[PDB]
Amino acid sequence: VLSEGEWQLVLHVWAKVEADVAGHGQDIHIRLFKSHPETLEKHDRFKHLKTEAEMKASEDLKKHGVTELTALGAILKKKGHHEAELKPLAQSHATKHKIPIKYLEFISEAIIHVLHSRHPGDFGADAQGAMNKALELFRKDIAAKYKELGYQG
Ligand code: ZNH
Ligand SMILES: [Fe+2]
Ligand SMILES: [Fe+2]
DSSP states (O other): OOOHHHHHHHHHHHHHHTTSHHHHHHHHHHHHHHHOTHHHHHSTTTTTOOSHHHHHHOHHHHHHHHHHHHHHHHHHTTTTOOHHHHHHHHHHHHHTSOOOHHHHHHHHHHHHHHHHHHOGGGOOHHHHHHHHHHHHHHHHHHHHHHHHHTOOO
């Protein structure tokens, strides 16, 4: 459980992400795929894209990153009160996409890196700490939902 001030830091930087959701979602995917290529393989419909510029040019990839980050933003705005939003996400990710919690860790790392690289003046140590705690809470709770579904993430 985060403090009110930690939530405010998370939502303040999130409002910066919302100025360009598509571009942040591209950058986070490209960082994730470069850092951890197995994660590209899980995105079965995007495995063909060869370079960063091919990734940025893909409308399908851009639209997917907006869907992904819109769901995360809706979860963060609930300030931990997110069972209703988490539930369907855990269902699809445990049963259809088969995303292990470790890959949620990898993308949390990519989110922190991209937020820091785009917004350093609004994402210092305290905001980083608050976003880390927010994403750790998301991962803990989605891992409990995975188990409810019979999936060990
Ligand atoms: C932050 C965190 C996160 C979030 C919020 C999300 C969200 C999301 C959403 C909303 C969607 C749509 C719906 C469904 O479910 O299906 C998706 C899809 C999705 N997903 Zn995911 N995710 C994520 C992570 C992820 C990761 C990490 C991975 C890998 C690795 C993934 C993989 C995925 C896939 C593969 C899909 C499908 C895509 C297409 O369309 O193709 N995922 N996703
Ligand atoms: Fe592989
Ligand atoms: Fe994705």
